[PDB]
Amino acid sequence: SDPMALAKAKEIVASAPVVVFSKSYCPFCVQVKKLFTQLGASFKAIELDTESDGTEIQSALAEWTGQRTVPNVFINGKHIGGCDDTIALNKGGKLVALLTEAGA
């Protein structure tokens, strides 16, 4: 797959608005998903452990964005990073913006 993988990855992120690459069993990914939901957001999630490819993706996402952990939050305009970040963008009443611009 490889570049075939990197495509699907990108394909996914496009539409969106929000996209969280994720695993089923990831504590943090769930904090994210909630944050959105309790924000009035709307997203699309992709549990990579579920899918047969998802591991290649993860490799793709790594090359592409340098983030090997999950989740991988995208808000329309590309890469936000992790939960680890997404929250901090909510500290300052901004994450509500980017989400709005993308649609809530």
List, as one string, the DSSP characters of 7-65. HHHHHHHSS-SEEEEE-TT-HHHHHHHHHHHTTT--EEEEETTTSSSTHHHHHHHHHHH
Residues whose CB is less than 8 angstroms from the CB of residue 39 and which lie 6 or more positions away in sequence, other chains included: 90, 95, 96, 99, 104
- Rounded CA separation 83/64 (Å): 18
How many domains would you assign to the chain?
Answer: 1
Domain that holds residue 5: 1-104
Q: What is the CATH number of the domain that holds 58?
A: 3.40.30.10
- Rounded CA separation 73/48 (Å): 14
Tell me which method was used to determine the 3D structure: X-ray
Query: Within the chain, what is the greatest distance between any pair of CA atoms?
Result: 40
Helix (H, G, I), strand (E, B) or coil at 77: coil
Q: In what order do the strands lie in the sheet with 18-22?
A: 43-47, 18-22, 72-75, 79-81
Helix (H, G, I), strand (E, B) or coil at 74: strand
Resolution of the experimental model, in Å, one decimal? 3.0
Residues whose CB is less than 8 angstroms from the CB of residue 16 and which lie 6 or more positions away in sequence, other chains included: 44, 74, 75, 76, 102
